[PDB]
What we know:
Two copies of one chain form a homodimer.
Chain A: H1 6-10, E1 17-22, E2 31-34, E3 37-39, E4 42-45, E5 52-57, H2 60-64, E6 69-72, E7 75-78, E8 89-93, E9 104-114, E10 119-125, E11 128-129, E12 133-135, E13 139-140, E14 146-155, H3 156-160, E15 164-171, E16 179-184
Bound molecules: a molecule of 8 linked components (NAG-NAG-BMA-MAN-NAG-MAN-NAG-FUC) and potassium ion.
Domain Ig-like (chain A): 1-79, 88-184
Region (CH2) (chain A): 1-82
Region (CH3) (chain A): 83-186
Amino acid sequence: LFPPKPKDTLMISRTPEVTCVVVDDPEVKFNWYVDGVEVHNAKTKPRETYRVVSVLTVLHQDWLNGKEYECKVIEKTISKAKGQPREPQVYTLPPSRDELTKNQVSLTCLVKGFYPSDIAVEWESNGRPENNYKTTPPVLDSDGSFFLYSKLTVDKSRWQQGNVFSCSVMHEALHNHYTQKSLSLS
Amino acid sequence: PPCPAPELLGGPSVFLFPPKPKDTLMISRTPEVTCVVVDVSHEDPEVKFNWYVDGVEVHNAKTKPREEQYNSTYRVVSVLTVLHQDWLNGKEYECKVSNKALPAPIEKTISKAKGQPREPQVYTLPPSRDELTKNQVSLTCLVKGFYPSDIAVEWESNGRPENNYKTTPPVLDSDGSFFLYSKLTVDKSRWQQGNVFSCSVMHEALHNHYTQKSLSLS
Lengths: 186, 218
Ligand SMILES: *[C@@H]1O[C@H](CO[C@@H]2O[C@@H](C)[C@@H](O)[C@@H](O)[C@@H]2O)[C@@H](O[C@@H]2O[C@H](CO)[C@@H](O[C@@H]3O[C@H](CO[C@H]4O[C@H](CO)[C@@H](O)[C@H](O)[C@@H]4O[C@@H]4O[C@H](CO)[C@@H](O)[C@H](O)[C@H]4NC(C)=O)[C@@H](O)[C@H](O[C@H]4O[C@H](CO)[C@@H](O)[C@H](O)[C@@H]4O[C@@H]4O[C@H](CO)[C@@H](O)[C@H](O)[C@H]4NC(C)=O)[C@@H]3O)[C@H](O)[C@H]2NC(C)=O)[C@H](O)[C@H]1NC(C)=O
Ligand SMILES: [K+]
């Protein structure tokens, strides 16, 4: 079993789903038990050795409250990490002086000290999303928490102006499951 | 009432491993291609290694002693020392293992990433204006636009290495290259005292396979 994408579980915009994957007789049996009670609102994807995948749509309040989901083929149970939540520290980093010589600069967002690793980072400017950005996977730090970096690449002309860029971070331990930190030239 | 011997119904598995990226780029270390054979049946423990470098057989390998694991099985490792020039040019290395418990000999091959190299751009980033409140500040090193992913990152201060750092794995960027970050955590007192820290990056596409960028308080 595989957990849903952290944004699907922390944002009401996308529908989260728990995915059961079987790799390596094409008849298979999937029995989904949500918190003990058997549910029959799951759909199994077509097969394609062959691999059969079963998907059960979960509710945002259901997953975020840590209710357990069981896939019965083999019996596997998955849920949110039971560790004590830690609030992410969000800091923005301007491009280096040595990078200003190039035509595009890299705006850096450090998101440190959060738990669990389930998180989602996005970049936005003037209310519109940004296209050219990538974010590292969460990295286990020394104190048992997690950190990551998010790199937004914009044209230097936008940075050379007074344009304002903001780092959007979404974590379970955040107020309203959402926070922002801005970054601009001055 | 002791249970009987383990079943071990199957065959020995083999896993080939490339040399460490640091050893392949620094003249102070010896790079090795490692051929590990696991699940060696105790009834038939003899293993035979045939090393092939791009087709031509090599006979300059060393085999480490057997190691019996907690699951009562053996582990036979054979190591082949490689030349820095040969690995960096993309030479293929083939390990051929032969055992009585294997129906046909298992063969694995490892080599350097074949793409057109890209030179990394290294930038150091000082702690954020908000982070100076804490007793420890984060020193950030951005390494972007390099291919292949095999790379080595370290930190250093006053000619001595800095150990308390963490580096993210390589992340595929939009242009087919890679980027990553390395976070060095130091006491705000050391950062305020004007000490100079350095991010050292080791990549095959760099000049002399090495570069440094320093960082100090303004
Ligand atoms: C009996 O037990 C032993 C060992 O267990 C020991 O005792 C128990 C009690 C525990 O305490 C264990 O911790 C302890 O080790 C069993 O032997 C194990 O067998 C499994 C597989 O059955 C092996 O897993 C493989 O792991 C490799 C990478 O492993 C690294 O990390 C290990 C620690 O996590 C470390 O011990 C390894 O040595 C190795 O670390 C490397 O070490 C070398 C030193 O020689 C060093 O040079 C390297 O730098 C270093 N590297 C790193 C990163 O640390 C993993 O890569 C394998 O996965 C491949 O294969 C899978 C298919 O089985 C697949 O699912 C994976 O995705 C991956 O797929 C491959 O990907 C490559 C990528 O290019 C691709 O080319 C391939 O085509 C693709 N497919 C294949 C088939 O390769 C794999 O998971 C353990 O390493 C091994 N432990 C050993 C040898 O110590 C034994 O099986 C048990 N037997 C029984 C009967 O129970
Ligand atoms: K040499």
